[PDB]
Amino acid sequence: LDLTAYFDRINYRGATDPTLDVLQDLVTVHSRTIPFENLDPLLGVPVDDLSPQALADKLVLRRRGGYCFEHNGLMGYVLAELGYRVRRFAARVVWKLAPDAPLPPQTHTLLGVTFPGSGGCYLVDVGFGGQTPTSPLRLETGAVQPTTHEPYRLEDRVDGFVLQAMVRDTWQTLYEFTTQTRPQIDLKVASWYASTHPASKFVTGLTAAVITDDARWNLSGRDLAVHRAGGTEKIRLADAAAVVDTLSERFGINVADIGERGALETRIDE
Secondary structure, eight states, rough: OOOOHHHHHOOSSSSSSOOOOHHHHHHHHHHHHEEEEEEEHHHHHOOOOOOOOHHHIIIIISSOOOOOOHHHHHHHHHHHTTTEEEEEEEEOOTHHHHHHSSOOOOEEEEEEEOTTTTTSSSSEESSSSSOEEEEOOOOOOOOBBBOOOSSEEEETTTEEEEEEOSSSSSSSEEEEEOOOOOOOHHEEEEEEHHHOOTTTTHHHHHEEEEEEETTEEEETTTTEOOOOEEEEEEEEOOSSSHHHHHHHHHHHOOGGGSSOHHHHHHHHHH
C-alpha cells in the first residue's frame, strides 16, 4: 500500500533500489521488528484476506505480527513495489520429523525473488517463525550457504528441494517445496485451512517468534525460549498475565489491538 509507513514501522533507512543488499537489509530489519504470532487464528479470527491493504493494515498500521501468509504476503508486496520479481511458493513443513507421520498439508509459503543482474532466483522467507532464514538464499542445491545466523542449505528431492538449517552441528530439515508459482487463491485456501481447521496448531496453541542480532526468540504456549550461540535458555511463565506481558514487552505485539489487555489474559488462561 504505502511503503513510507512500512519503512517507518520497521525503521528502515537505506537504499530502495532492487539490489541484493537492500534485499538482505530489509529481511534483517523486518525479522527484527514484525513478530511471528497467531493470535488472530487462536482467538477465532481467520486469516483469509491476503491483499496488500489487509496485510498492511494489520502488520503495519495496527502494530501486529502475523504468520507465514501474512509475513511473506507483506514482504512479497514490498519487493514487488520496489522492482523485484516475486513468485510465491507453497511448502510442507516437515521439521522435527516423524517419518511415521503423514505428509503435512501445504500450509507454508515462501518467495522466489529475482532483481536486475541477479545471479538467478533468491529464496526469501520471513514467515517460518523462530527458525526462518535471516539472509536471502541463492536457490542452488548442495552449496552450504552462510547467513547472518546459522548457515542454510537446499538439497534436491524428487521434483522438489528441501530447505535445511545447521542447528547444533546437525543439518535440520525445515520444509519441502516446489518452485511452482502459486496464485493468490490457492494461498487463500491454505491459509483458510491453517487459521480455521480445529486440528491446526495455529488454532490449538500459541506460537510467537522474533529474531535479533544474536538470538532467535520462540514462545510456545507459556514456554519462552531464546536460542543463542551458547545454547538455549528456557523458562515456563507463571500466569496468563506473564504471557501477555511477554508478547507486548518482548515480542512487541500491540496486544491492545485485541481488545482490553485485561480482557485478553482470560482467553489465554484457556
